[PDB]
Scaffold this active site. Structure first.
Site, PDB file in Angstrom:
ATOM      1  N   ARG B  59       0.823  -1.199   0.000  1.00 51.02           N
ATOM      2  CA  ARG B  59       0.000   0.000   0.000  1.00 51.02           C
ATOM      3  C   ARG B  59       0.862   1.257   0.000  1.00 51.02           C
ATOM      4  NH1 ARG B  59      -1.846   0.509   4.364  1.00 51.02           N
ATOM      5  NH2 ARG B  59      -1.366  -1.540   5.299  1.00 51.02           N
ATOM      6  N   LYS B 207      -8.894  -1.885   0.102  1.00 49.01           N
ATOM      7  CA  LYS B 207      -8.828  -1.151   1.354  1.00 49.01           C
ATOM      8  C   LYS B 207      -9.439   0.232   1.261  1.00 49.01           C
ATOM      9  CE  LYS B 207      -7.098  -3.701   4.685  1.00 49.01           C
ATOM     10  NZ  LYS B 207      -6.743  -5.002   4.113  1.00 49.01           N
ATOM     11  N   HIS B 226     -11.258  -4.300  11.682  1.00 48.11           N
ATOM     12  CA  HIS B 226     -10.144  -4.914  10.960  1.00 48.11           C
ATOM     13  C   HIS B 226      -9.800  -6.224  11.660  1.00 48.11           C
ATOM     14  CE1 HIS B 226      -5.816  -4.747   9.270  1.00 48.11           C
ATOM     15  NE2 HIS B 226      -6.631  -5.301   8.392  1.00 48.11           N
ATOM     16  N   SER B 244      -2.372  -7.534   8.993  1.00 42.46           N
ATOM     17  CA  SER B 244      -2.156  -8.747   8.222  1.00 42.46           C
ATOM     18  C   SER B 244      -0.736  -9.245   8.460  1.00 42.46           C
ATOM     19  CB  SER B 244      -2.430  -8.518   6.736  1.00 42.46           C
ATOM     20  OG  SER B 244      -1.768  -7.357   6.272  1.00 42.46           O
ATOM     21  N   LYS B 248      -4.150 -13.226  12.105  1.00 46.47           N
ATOM     22  CA  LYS B 248      -5.607 -13.281  12.075  1.00 46.47           C
ATOM     23  C   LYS B 248      -6.110 -14.287  11.053  1.00 46.47           C
ATOM     24  CE  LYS B 248      -6.301  -9.040   9.313  1.00 46.47           C
ATOM     25  NZ  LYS B 248      -6.503  -9.727   7.957  1.00 46.47           N
ATOM     26  N   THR B 249      -5.383 -14.477   9.964  1.00 45.99           N
ATOM     27  CA  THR B 249      -5.776 -15.499   8.997  1.00 45.99           C
ATOM     28  C   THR B 249      -5.493 -16.891   9.540  1.00 45.99           C
ATOM     29  OG1 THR B 249      -5.419 -14.030   7.111  1.00 45.99           O
ATOM     30  CG2 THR B 249      -5.373 -16.411   6.691  1.00 45.99           C
ATOM     31  N   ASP B 263     -10.623 -10.433   7.075  1.00 46.15           N
ATOM     32  CA  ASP B 263      -9.961  -9.130   7.196  1.00 46.15           C
ATOM     33  C   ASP B 263     -10.870  -7.961   7.557  1.00 46.15           C
ATOM     34  OD1 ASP B 263      -7.364  -7.612   6.737  1.00 46.15           O
ATOM     35  OD2 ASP B 263      -8.568  -6.605   5.202  1.00 46.15           O
ATOM     36  N   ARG B 327       1.254 -11.979  -2.375  1.00 42.12           N
ATOM     37  CA  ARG B 327      -0.159 -12.130  -2.066  1.00 42.12           C
ATOM     38  C   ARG B 327      -0.817 -13.098  -3.045  1.00 42.12           C
ATOM     39  NH1 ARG B 327      -2.737  -9.048   2.387  1.00 42.12           N
ATOM     40  NH2 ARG B 327      -1.015  -7.704   3.026  1.00 42.12           N
TER      41      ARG B 327
END
Ligand SMILES: O=C([O-])CC(=O)C(=O)O
Lengths: 535, 534
Positions: B59, B207, B226, B244, B248-249, B263, B327
């Site tokens: 980003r 995003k 988030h 990320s 969390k995944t 997400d 990704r």
């Protein structure tokens, strides 16, 4: 060779002499289980012996000394006489005799290995060197790295220089003698001898003679160059200047080219010639897929240095725990894609300066003007990588004159003068290639750098369209096959392009201040206009 | 869809429109051999198409701008408001019209892909978003990541928001306009539009809508979060907040739990709902042995981004030499253990804050008091991973308010207010889980952390006996099934408890300095007592 013949050097009570040991003999000696400490060798899965050198995982420039005497007083580039820093620290004849006593005493009363070899591929300028050690693997190192004479050449061998490796001894009187430490790497050009005390790093046994060639050759109008060198199918030669770890070994083993050499070359009326009989390649992160020619050279008769070997005997080339400056030496014929029967070819047509720019300011590739070539050769901006000299733990930006300041015995301008003369006669074009980092903080990709070298070597950039980078005034090609056009401008990899401007101003000033010392002649003053300019 | 309809957005002379293309058509379009540059797609041996976005490997927060007008002036948490660091840089309406003209001219005179999609699983709060691109793989990205409407829903589809991807154009006037670069990610809440200029990173296309949901939802009392989310057999929902790459995944993948999403989630009167139709997973070091479900989602209709593809078409998932922020995107149904057919469930009763503590100070698990829940949500201490934003190349400690500061359009306290309201109504309990490092300098083992999550989700810690970590005053369970009790106290990985106190006080100072901006209200001032105390 007779014990008395070694007595001439000051060694006494020589037991046995292992002269010109074969590779078979060295292999058996290196695996003898009675060896202790840093003498011990182990056999790896690849069939090559591996050794370790303790804390001596890189060179010791702070322990380098040259005797100041009638031979060297008025000719050497001395560490205490010039505007520019160097490692050529003066040594008195008295203190030299003390160091020589330490070494000859250490090598006395012992079984010794003696290797006679040549430094320099051409008989008219080569040094005949006699190396003396009490450790088999050190004899193996110099058999690998120097040119191995024929039996007929041995019969008539007359040494020009003696190198005595007394790694096992140290100098207890060093503080009172004003030296840097109990270790020493000392040269006497009147007695024509190099001494090694304390340090077990293999490179000390080859860069000494490189320094000596760097003294003798430019005085005869022959360039003496810290570069790798290869040749295309049509006989076009390229040389790649840089410090180790900045790409010269990796870029020179190009499958489209034939290797002349790795590290040390001369340039005379016939062309570019290797001084060495082998290559001392950095192995950190080496893989078969990434460097297949070098990886395949690691087999019996190669000598691995400070690599991590697992309990099962396999090598973990990625492990820098003993040092990032892991190495392997091998005789040059362990690479199939080399020039034979002698490691030399014609004049260079392409001169590549590799710069590992830790500031991420310089372009991946720039085509230099004639004045920029001299300016950037004298400047030598790049980085010292971890371990290459003792105490360096991370990439350290540096101005290393001629891309090899640590090995220069003469003033940098004397190397530049000869290089320019040879380049002009050949019409050679020079390029500045950043093998360091970009604005992303990441290292520039080897895939991109190899594609850049491909484009240099096939001539496609010589007349290509360019734009000019501000401040440095470097011409950058507008596009380059096989490379993302966006990375050619070093400004694009910055999240905020104003940060490039800031770091560029900073680096520009470092260049100007470093170069000032070269402006004490009209010619040198005239090169300022080719350097970076502040607004 | 007709050309006239797109000309209303300012685009001129529209040739062909490819409207809501199928996955099959997108695969054909992406492998067109006439494609050059960052448009090019290659096929991997797993059957998934791969693309490369050049230098845009993460980003670009420094290129994010929001128009400051009568809609946003008094409501947005502006970067120049003096109320804490954020990326909500203001943009003039005049400069917006310039950026928009750059994009609409770039998209004029050519074949366009248009994807209509939803952001939000519930019809009452979802945005109807229309994406316009000139590159098939960008349309594929949004097809994956947003909710794919049925034929009936497309019939009367009415866009609430327009996203124009003009990656191929840039802004040559950027310096004189006071902008950060020639690139731009710009938002106008009056015209209801996002523009993308210069940057090709796929995540800019998801995003931005997250940031818009983060504006609209909390203003009407709906939490916008988030986090990842999942649900057990009994219907009990958990949410895992974090950046990320901090767990969390991974930690929401659990055979006992169906995945709701990865997400971006909302929390309304009826429960927790995914905003997205897919997952944009980090693939650095991915292996089939270690992450089988994500690995098995990499097949046709997934889209790989910046992963190294060898000459034979195999994938080198370990190569981070271009970026560590490699990704893949895929529609959510590439994961088998999911809630279907709609990615939502009831109210969360377990709220897990994931902190990638690079200092080895915090316990692997603490059960937070109500005031500590607010204190640590607002603080959002964790780390940003390499490549996630341009220029980051190593784990970077950060205080990311609400575990998603880069996407907050409103002040952090507005996200805390609504989260607390939903938790209190649901009887939810919060836990702080260290997914980073311990005293030794090594990373807390995933096996321990997975055992910790199991113990949270079955309710075994809610009433368990605890001891109190000093300074931070964190209640730690005295033992926990499946972990060596030794690990629960963060001091045990230090030679001495004094060595921990040293590190702890350094970190506590950063917490205290970071929280001070929240203390102008009586409620914020009262929360300091829940934070670390030197
Ligand atoms: O090449 C350098 O800069 C150092 C080196 O290899 C050597 O130590 O032999």
């Amino acid at each position: 060779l007779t014990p008395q013949e070694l007595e001439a050097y000051g060694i006494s009570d020589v037991h046995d002499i292992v002269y010109n040991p074969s590779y078979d003999l060295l292999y058996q000696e290196e695996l003898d289980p009675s060896l202790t400490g840093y003498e011990r060798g182990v056999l790896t899965n690849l069939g090559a012996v591996a050794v370790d050198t303790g804390i001596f995982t890189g060179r010791s420039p702070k322990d380098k000394y040259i005797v100041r005497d009638d031979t060297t007083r008025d000719t050497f580039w001395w560490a205490d006489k010039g505007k520019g820093k160097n490692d050529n620290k003066p040594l008195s004849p008295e203190t030299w005799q003390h160091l020589k006593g330490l070494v000859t005493r250490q090598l006395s009363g012992k079984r010794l290995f003696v290797v006679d070899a040549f430094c320099g591929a051409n008989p008219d300028t080569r040094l005949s060197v006699r190396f003396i050690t009490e450790v088999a693997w050190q004899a193996h190192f110099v058999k690998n790295m120097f040119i191995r004479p024929s039996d007929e050449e041995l019969a008539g061998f007359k040494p020009d220089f003696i190198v005595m490796n007394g790694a096992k001894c140290t100098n207890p009187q060093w503080k009172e003698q004003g030296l840097n430490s109990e270790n020493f790497v000392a040269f006497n050009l009147t007695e024509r001898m190099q001494l090694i005390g304390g340090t077990w790093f293999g490179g000390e046994m080859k860069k000494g003679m490189f320094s000596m060639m760097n003294y003798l050759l430019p005085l005869k109008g022959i360039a003496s160059m810290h570069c790798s060198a290869n040749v295309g199918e049509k006989g076009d030669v390229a040389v790649f200047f840089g410090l180790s770890g900045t790409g010269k070994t990796t870029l020179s083993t190009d499958p489209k080219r034939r290797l002349i050499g790795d590290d040390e070359h001369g340039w005379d009326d016939d062309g570019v010639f290797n001084f060495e009989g082998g290559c001392y390649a950095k192995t950190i992160k080496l893989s078969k897929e990434a460097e297949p020619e070098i990886y395949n050279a690691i087999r019996r008769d190669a000598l691995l240095e400070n690599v991590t070997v697992r309990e099962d005997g396999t090598i973990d080339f990625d492990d820098g725990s003993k040092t990032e400056n892991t190495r392997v030496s091998y005789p040059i014929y362990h690479i199939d894609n080399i020039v034979k029967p002698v490691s030399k070819a014609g004049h260079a047509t392409k001169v590549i300066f590799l710069t590992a720019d830790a500031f991420g300011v310089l372009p991946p590739v720039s085509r230099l003007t004639a004045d920029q070539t001299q300016y950037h050769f004298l400047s030598g901006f790049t980085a010292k990588l971890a371990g290459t000299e003792r105490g360096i733990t991370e990439p350290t930006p540096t101005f290393s004159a001629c891309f090899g300041a640590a090995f220069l015995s003469l003033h940098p301008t004397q190397y530049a003068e000869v290089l320019v003369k040879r380049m002009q006669a050949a019409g050679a074009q020079a390029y500045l290639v950043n093998t360091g980092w970009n604005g992303t903080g990441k290292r520039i990709s080897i895939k991109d750098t190899r594609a850049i070298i491909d484009a240099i070597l096939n001539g496609s950039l010589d007349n290509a369209e360019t734009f000019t980078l501000p401040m440095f005034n470097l011409a950058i090609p507008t596009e380059l096959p096989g490379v993302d056009t966006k990375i050619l401008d070093p400004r694009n990899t910055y999240a905020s392009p104003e940060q490039w401007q800031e770091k560029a101003e900073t680096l520009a000033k470092l260049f100007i201040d470093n170069f000032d010392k070269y402006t004490d002649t009209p010619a040198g003053a005239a090169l300022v206009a080719a350097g970076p300019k502040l607004h």
